[PDB]
CSV table of C-alpha atoms and ligand atoms in Angstrom, one decimal:
chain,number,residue,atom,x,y,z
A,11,UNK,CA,0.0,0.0,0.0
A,12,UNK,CA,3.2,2.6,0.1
A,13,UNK,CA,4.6,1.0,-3.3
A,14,UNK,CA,0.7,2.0,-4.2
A,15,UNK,CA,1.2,5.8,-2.8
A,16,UNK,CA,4.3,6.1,-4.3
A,17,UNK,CA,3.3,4.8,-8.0
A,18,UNK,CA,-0.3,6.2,-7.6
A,19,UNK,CA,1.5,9.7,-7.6
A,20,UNK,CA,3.9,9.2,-9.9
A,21,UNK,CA,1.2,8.3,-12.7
A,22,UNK,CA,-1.1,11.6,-11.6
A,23,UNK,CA,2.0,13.5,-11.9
A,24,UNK,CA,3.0,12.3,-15.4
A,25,UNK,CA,-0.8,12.7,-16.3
A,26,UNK,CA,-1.1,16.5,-14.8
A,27,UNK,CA,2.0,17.8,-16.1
A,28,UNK,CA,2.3,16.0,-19.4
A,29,UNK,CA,0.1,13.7,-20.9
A,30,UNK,CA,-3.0,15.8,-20.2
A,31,UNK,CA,-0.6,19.4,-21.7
A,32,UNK,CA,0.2,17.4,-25.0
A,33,UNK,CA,-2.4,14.8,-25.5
A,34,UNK,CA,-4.9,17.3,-26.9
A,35,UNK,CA,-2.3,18.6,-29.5
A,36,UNK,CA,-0.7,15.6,-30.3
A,37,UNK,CA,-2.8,14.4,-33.6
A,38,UNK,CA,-2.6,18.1,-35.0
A,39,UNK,CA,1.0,18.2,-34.4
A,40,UNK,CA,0.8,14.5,-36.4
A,41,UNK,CA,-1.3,15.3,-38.9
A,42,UNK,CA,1.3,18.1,-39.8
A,43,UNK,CA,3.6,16.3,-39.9
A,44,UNK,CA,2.1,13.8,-42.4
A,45,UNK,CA,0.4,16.3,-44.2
A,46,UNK,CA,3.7,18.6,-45.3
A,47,UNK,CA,6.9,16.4,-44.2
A,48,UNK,CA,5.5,12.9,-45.0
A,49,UNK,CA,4.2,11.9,-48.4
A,50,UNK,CA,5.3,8.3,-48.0
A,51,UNK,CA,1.7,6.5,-48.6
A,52,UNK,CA,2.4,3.7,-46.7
A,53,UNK,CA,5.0,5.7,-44.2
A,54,UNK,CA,2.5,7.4,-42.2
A,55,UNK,CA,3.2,8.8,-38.7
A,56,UNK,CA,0.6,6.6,-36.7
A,57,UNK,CA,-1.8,8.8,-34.6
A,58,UNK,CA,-0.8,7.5,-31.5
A,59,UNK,CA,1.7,8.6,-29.0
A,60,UNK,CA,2.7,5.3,-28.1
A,61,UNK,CA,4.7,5.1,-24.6
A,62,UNK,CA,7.3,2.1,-23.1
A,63,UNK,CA,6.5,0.6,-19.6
A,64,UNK,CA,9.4,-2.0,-19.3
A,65,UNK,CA,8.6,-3.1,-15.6
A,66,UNK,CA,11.5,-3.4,-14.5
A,67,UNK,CA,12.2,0.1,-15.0
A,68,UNK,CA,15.1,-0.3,-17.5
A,69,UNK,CA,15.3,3.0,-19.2
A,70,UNK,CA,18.3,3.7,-21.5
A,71,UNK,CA,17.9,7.1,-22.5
A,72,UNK,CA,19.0,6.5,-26.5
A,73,UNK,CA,16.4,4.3,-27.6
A,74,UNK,CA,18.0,3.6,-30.9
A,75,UNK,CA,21.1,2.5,-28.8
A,76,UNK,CA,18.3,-0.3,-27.3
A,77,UNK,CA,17.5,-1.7,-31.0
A,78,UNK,CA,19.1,-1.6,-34.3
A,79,UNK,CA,15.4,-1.8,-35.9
A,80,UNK,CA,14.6,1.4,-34.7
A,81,UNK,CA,16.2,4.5,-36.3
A,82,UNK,CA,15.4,8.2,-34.9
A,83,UNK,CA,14.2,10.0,-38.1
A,84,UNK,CA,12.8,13.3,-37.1
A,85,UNK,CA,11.0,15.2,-34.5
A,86,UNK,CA,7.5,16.5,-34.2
A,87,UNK,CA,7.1,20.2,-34.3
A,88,UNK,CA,7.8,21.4,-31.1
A,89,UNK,CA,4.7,22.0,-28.4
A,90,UNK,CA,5.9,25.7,-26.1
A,91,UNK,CA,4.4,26.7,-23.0
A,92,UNK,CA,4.7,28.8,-19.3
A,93,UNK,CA,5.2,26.6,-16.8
A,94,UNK,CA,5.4,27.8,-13.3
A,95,UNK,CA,7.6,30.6,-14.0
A,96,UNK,CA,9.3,29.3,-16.8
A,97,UNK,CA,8.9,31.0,-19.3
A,98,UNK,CA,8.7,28.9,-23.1
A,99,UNK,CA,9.2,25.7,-21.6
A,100,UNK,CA,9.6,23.1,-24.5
A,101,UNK,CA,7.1,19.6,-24.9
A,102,UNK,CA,9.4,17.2,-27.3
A,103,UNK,CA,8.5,13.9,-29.2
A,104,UNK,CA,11.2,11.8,-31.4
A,105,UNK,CA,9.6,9.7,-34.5
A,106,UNK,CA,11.0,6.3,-35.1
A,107,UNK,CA,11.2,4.1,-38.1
A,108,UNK,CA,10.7,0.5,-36.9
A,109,UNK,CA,12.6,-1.6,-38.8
A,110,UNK,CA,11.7,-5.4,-40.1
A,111,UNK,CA,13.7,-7.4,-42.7
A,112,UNK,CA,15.1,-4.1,-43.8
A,113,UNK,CA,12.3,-3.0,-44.8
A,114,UNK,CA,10.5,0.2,-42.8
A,115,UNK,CA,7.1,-1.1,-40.9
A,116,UNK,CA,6.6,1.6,-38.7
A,117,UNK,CA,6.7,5.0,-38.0
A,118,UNK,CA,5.8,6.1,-34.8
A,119,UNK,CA,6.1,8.8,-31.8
A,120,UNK,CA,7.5,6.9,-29.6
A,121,UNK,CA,9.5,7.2,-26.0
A,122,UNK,CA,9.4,5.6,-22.3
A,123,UNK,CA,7.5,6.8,-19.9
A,124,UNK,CA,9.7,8.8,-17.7
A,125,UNK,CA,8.8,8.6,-14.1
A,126,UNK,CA,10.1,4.7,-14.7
A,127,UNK,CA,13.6,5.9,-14.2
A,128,UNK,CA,12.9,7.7,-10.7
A,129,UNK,CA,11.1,4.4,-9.0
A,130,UNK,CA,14.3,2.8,-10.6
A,131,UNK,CA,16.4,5.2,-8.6
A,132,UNK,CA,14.5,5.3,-5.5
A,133,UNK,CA,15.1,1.3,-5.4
A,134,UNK,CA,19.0,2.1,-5.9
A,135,UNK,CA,19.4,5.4,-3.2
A,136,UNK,CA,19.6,4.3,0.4
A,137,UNK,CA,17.7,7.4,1.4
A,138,UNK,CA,14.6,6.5,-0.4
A,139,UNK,CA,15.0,3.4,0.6
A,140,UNK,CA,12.9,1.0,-1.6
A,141,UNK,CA,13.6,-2.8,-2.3
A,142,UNK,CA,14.0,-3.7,-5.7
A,143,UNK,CA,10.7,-5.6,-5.2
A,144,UNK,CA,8.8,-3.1,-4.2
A,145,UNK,CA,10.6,-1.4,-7.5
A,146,UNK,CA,8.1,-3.9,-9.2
A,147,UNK,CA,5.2,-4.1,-7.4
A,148,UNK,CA,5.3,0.1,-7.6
A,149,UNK,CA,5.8,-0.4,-12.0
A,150,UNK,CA,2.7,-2.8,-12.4
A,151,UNK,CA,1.0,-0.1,-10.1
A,152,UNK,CA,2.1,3.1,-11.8
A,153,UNK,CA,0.9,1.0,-15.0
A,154,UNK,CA,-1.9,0.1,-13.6
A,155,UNK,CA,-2.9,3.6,-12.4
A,156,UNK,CA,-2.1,5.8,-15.7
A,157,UNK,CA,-4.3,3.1,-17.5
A,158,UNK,CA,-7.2,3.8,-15.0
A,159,UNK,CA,-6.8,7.8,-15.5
A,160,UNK,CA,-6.0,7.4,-19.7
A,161,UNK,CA,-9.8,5.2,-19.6
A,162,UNK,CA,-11.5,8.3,-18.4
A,163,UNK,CA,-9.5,11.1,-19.5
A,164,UNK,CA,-10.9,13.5,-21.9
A,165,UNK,CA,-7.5,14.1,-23.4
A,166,UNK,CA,-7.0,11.1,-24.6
A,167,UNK,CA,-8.9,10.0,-27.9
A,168,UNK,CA,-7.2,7.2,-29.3
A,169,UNK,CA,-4.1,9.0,-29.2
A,170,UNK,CA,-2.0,7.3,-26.9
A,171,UNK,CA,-1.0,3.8,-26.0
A,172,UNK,CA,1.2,2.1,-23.4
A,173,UNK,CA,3.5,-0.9,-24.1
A,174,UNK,CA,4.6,-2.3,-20.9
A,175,UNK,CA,6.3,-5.8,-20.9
A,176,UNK,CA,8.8,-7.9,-18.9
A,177,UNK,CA,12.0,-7.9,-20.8
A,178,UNK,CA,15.3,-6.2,-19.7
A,179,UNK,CA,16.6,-4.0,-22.2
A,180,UNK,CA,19.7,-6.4,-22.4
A,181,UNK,CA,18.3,-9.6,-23.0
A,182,UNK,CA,19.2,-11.6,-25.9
A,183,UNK,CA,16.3,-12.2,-27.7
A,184,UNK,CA,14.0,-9.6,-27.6
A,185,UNK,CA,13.0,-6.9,-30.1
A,186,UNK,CA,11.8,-3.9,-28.6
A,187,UNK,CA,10.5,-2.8,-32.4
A,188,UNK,CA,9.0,-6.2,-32.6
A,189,UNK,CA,7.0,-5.4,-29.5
A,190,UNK,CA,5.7,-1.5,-30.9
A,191,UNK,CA,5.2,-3.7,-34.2
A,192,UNK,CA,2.8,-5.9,-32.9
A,193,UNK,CA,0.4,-3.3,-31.4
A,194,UNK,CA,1.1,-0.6,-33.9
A,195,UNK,CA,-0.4,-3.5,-36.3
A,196,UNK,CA,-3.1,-4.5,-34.4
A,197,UNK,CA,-4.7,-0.6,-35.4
B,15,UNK,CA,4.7,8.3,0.4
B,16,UNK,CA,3.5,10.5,-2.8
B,17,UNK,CA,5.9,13.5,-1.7
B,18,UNK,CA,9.0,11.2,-1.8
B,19,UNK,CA,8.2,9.9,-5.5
B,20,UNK,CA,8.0,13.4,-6.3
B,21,UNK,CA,11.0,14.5,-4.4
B,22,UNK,CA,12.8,12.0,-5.9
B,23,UNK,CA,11.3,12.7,-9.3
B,24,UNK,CA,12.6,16.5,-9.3
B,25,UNK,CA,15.9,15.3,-8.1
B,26,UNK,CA,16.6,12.7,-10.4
B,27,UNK,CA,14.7,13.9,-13.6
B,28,UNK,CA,15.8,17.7,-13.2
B,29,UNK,CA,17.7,18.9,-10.3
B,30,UNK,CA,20.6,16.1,-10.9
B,31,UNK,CA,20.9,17.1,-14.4
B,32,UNK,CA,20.4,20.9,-15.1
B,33,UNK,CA,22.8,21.8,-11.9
B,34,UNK,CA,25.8,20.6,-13.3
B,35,UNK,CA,25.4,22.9,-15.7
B,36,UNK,CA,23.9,26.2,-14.4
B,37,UNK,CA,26.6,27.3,-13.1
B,38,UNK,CA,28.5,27.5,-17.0
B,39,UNK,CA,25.0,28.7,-18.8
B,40,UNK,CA,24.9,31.5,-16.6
B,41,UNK,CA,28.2,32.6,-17.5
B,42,UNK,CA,27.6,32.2,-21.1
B,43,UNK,CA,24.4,34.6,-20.3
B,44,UNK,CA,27.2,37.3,-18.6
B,45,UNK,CA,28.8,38.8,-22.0
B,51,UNK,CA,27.0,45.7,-17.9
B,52,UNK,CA,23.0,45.4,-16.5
B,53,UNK,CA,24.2,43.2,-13.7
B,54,UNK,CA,25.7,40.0,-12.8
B,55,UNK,CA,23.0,37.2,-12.2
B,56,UNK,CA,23.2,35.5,-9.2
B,57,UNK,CA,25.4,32.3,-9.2
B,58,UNK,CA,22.2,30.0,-7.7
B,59,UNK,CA,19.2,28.7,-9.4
B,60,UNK,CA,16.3,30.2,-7.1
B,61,UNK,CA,13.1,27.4,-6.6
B,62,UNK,CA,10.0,28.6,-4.7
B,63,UNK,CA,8.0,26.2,-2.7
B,64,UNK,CA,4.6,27.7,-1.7
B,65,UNK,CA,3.2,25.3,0.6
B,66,UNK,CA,-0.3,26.3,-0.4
B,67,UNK,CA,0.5,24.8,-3.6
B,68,UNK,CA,-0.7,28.1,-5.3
B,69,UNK,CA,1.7,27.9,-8.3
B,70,UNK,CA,1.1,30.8,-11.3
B,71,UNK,CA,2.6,29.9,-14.5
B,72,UNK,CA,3.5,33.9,-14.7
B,73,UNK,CA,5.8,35.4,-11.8
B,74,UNK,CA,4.6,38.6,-12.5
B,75,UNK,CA,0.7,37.3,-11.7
B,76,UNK,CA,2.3,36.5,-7.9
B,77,UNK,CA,3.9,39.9,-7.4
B,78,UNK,CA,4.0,43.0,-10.3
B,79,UNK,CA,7.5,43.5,-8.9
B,80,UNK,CA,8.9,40.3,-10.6
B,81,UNK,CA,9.5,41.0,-13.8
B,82,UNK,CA,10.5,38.9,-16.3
B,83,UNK,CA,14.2,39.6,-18.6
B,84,UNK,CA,15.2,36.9,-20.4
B,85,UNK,CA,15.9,33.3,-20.6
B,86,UNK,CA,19.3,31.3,-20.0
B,87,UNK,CA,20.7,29.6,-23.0
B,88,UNK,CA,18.8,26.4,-23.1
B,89,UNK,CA,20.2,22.8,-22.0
B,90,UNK,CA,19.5,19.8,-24.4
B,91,UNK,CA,19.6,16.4,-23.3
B,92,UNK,CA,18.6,12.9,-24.5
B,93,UNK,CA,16.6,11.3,-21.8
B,94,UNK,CA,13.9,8.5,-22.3
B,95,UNK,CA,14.0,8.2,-26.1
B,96,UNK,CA,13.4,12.0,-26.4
B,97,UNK,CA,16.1,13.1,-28.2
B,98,UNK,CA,17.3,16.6,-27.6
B,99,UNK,CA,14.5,17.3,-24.6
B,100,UNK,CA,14.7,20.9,-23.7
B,101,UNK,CA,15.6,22.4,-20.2
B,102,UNK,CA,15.0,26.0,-20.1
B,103,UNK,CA,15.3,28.8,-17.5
B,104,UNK,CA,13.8,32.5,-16.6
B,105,UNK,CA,15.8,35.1,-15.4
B,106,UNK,CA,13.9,37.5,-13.9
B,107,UNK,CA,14.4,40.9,-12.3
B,108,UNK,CA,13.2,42.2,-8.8
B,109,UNK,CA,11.9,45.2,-8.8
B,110,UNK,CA,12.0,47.8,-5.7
B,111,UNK,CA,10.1,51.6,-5.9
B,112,UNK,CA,9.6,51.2,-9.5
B,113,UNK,CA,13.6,50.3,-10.3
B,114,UNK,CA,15.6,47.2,-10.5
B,115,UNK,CA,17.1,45.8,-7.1
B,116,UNK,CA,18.6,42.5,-8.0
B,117,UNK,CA,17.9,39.3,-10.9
B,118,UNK,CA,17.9,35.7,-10.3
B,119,UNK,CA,16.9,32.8,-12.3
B,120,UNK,CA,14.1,31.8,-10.9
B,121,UNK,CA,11.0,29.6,-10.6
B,122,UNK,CA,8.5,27.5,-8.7
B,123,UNK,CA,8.8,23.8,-8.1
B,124,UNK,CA,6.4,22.5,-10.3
B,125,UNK,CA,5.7,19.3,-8.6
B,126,UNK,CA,3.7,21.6,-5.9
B,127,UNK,CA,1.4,22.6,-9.1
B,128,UNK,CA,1.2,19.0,-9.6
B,129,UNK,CA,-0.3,18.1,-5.8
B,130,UNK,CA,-2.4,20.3,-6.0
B,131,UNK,CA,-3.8,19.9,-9.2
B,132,UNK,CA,-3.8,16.5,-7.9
B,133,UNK,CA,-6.1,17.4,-5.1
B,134,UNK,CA,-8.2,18.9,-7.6
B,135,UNK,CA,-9.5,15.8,-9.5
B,136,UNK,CA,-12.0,13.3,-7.3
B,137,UNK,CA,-9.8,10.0,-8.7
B,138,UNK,CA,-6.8,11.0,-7.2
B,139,UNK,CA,-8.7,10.5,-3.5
B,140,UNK,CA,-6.3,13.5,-2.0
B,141,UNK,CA,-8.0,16.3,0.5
B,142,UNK,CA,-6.7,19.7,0.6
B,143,UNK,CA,-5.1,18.3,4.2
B,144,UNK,CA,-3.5,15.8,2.6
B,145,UNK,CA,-1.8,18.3,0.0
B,146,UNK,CA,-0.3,20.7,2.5
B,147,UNK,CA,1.2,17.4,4.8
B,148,UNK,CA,2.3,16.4,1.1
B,149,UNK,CA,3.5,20.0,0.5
B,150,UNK,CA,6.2,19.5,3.6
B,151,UNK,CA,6.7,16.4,3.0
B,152,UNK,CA,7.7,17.4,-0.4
B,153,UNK,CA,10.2,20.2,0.9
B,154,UNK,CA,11.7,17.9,3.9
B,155,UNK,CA,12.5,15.4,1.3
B,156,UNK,CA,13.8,17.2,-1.7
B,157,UNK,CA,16.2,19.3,1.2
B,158,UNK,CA,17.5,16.1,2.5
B,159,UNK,CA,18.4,14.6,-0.9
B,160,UNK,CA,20.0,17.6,-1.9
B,161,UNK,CA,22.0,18.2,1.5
B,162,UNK,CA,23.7,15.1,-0.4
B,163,UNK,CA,23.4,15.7,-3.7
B,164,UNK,CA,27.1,15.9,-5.4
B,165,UNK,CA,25.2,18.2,-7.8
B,166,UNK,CA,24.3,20.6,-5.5
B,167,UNK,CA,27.2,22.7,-5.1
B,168,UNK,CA,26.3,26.0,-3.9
B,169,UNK,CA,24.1,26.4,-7.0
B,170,UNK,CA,20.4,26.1,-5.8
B,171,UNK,CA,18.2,28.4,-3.1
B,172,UNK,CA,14.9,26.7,-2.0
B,173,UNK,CA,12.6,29.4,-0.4
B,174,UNK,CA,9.7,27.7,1.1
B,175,UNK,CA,6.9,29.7,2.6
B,176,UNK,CA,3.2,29.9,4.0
B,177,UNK,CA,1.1,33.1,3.1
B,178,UNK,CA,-2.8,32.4,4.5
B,179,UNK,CA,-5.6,33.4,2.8
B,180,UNK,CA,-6.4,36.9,1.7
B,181,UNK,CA,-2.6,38.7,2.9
B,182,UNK,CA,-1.0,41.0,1.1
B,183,UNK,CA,1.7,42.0,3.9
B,184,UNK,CA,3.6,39.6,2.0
B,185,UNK,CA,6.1,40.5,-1.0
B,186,UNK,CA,7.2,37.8,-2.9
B,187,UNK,CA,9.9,40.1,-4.4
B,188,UNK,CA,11.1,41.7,-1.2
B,189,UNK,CA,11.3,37.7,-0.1
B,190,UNK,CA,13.9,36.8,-2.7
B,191,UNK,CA,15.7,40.1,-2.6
B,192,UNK,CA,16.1,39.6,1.0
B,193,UNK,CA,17.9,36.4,0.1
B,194,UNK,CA,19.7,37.7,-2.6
B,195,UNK,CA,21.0,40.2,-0.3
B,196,UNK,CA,22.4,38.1,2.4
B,197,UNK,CA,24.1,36.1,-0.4
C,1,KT2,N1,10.7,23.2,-13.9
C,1,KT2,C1,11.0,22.1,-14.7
C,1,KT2,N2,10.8,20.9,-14.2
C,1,KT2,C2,11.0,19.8,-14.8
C,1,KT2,C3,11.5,19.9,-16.1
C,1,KT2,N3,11.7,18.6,-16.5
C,1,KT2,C4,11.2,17.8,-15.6
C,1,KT2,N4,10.8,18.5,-14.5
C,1,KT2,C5,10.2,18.1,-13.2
C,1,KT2,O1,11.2,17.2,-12.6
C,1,KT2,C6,10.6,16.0,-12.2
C,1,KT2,C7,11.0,14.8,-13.1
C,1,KT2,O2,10.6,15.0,-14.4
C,1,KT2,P1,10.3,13.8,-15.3
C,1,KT2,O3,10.7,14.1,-16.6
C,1,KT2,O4,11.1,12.6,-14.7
C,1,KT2,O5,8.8,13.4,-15.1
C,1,KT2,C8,7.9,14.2,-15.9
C,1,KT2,C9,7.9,13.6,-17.2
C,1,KT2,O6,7.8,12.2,-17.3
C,1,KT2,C10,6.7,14.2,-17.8
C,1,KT2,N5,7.1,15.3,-18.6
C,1,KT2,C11,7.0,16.6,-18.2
C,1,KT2,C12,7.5,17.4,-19.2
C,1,KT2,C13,8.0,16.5,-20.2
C,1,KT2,C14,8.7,16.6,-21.4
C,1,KT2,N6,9.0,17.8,-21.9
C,1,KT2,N7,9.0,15.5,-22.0
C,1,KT2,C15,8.8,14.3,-21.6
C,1,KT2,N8,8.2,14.1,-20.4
C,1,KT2,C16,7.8,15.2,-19.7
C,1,KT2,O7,5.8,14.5,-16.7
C,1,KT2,C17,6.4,14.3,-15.5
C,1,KT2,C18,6.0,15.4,-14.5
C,1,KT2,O8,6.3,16.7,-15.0
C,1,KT2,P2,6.5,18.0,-14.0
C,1,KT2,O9,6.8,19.1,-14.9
C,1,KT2,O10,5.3,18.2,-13.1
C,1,KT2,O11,7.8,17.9,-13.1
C,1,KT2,C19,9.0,17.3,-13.4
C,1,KT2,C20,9.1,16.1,-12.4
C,1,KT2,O12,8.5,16.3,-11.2
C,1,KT2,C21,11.8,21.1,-16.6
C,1,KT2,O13,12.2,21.3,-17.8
C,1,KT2,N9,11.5,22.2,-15.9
């Protein structure tokens, strides 16, 4: 029940100060993108921002690094805003190609969900103190919780989608492309 | 337990990684108005109360310009953005000092929080998670190898419907006995 605190306000945070700023925006910034930077007919950007939950909370911060498949090819136009006295504070999202028998498969907006790497820190920092289990238990929670607020949130409209699976980002044998593949495929 | 996530969270997904580098960004800013102050300045109203514009919290914090931005590839964002105000603090009309500056904006993020039925937090639980949020984030960076002289955390209650208090003369006063 405090591995559900902590992850419950992890996944309002990430909700309050992101996904609810640039959820409405997204498709237009999307459709832009298709409509003036894209003409590849069956290269679309999909519509969907779609968002990496590996619950163990391995987050390498060069996702290309992660998988030779995916190749960074471009950004979205940026999304500016005040924030709290900052003034012009900048909303980013990377495109990908996904990559399968060299051929491109997917293109897609595409990045981890940050708060991941703090419960990965808080379980590696005495003074927060948290077992690596409870590094676990708190990931299927935060997933758990930022599904609950995405299923009744009016910013999201078929615009976002969360990938969260098991593997380690070093394993052997599996494809993190392979894993956006088989969702981006199944819309 | 939700303050230490988000203690931890501005820590390790900010704090950690713009700090290193103030200290250089500023002095790329200083090429005659006035030397900014060597110290990021991060207010922590515990009422949670967090404008997006300084000037809507006092008139007499008034925004200058920014720092040169920090870029940073974090969580398959490449090139995220970390940007910073610097704003001046005016006194009888005329500049008194400048700081970069800004709220904490996980205390927007409580409160907004305590704001939506789903997340099941009172206004009592936001102000106990308010200082819990301060106590935290002040222990972790009492430790912090980052934090080197280079951050000022002003926390601070003003109750409801007081105007004896000036945000501006606040971080002046700080300013001034740094
Ligand atoms: N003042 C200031 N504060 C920042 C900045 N950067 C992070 N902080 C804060 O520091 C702590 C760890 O930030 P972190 O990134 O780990 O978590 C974030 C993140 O996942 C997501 N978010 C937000 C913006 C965003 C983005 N542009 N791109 C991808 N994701 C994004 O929303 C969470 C909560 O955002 P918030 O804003 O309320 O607080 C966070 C969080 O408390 C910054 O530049 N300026």
């Amino acid at each position: 029940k405090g591995n559900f605190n902590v992850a419950h306000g992890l996944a309002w945070s990430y909700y309050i100060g992101y996904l609810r700023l640039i959820l409405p925006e997204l498709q237009a910034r999307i459709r832009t993108y298709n409509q003036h930077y894209n003409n590849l007919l069956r290269g679309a950007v999909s519509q969907r921002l779609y968002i990496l939950l590996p619950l163990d909370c391995g987050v390498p911060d060069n996702l290309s690094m992660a998988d030779p498949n995916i190749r960074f090819l471009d950004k979205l136009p940026q999304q500016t805003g005040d924030r709290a006295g900052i003034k012009d504070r900048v909303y980013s999202n990377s495109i990908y190609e996904l990559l399968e028998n060299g051929q491109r498969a997917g293109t897609c907006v595409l990045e981890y969900a940050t708060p991941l790497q703090t419960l990965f820190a808080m379980s590696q920092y005495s003074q927060a103190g948290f077992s690596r289990e409870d590094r676990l238990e708190q990931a299927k929670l935060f997933c758990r919780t930022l599904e609950d607020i995405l299923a009744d949130a009016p910013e999201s409209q078929n615009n976002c989608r969360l990938i969260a699976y098991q593997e380690p980002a070093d394993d052997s044998s599996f494809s993190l492309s392979q894993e956006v593949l088989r969702h981006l495929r199944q819309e």
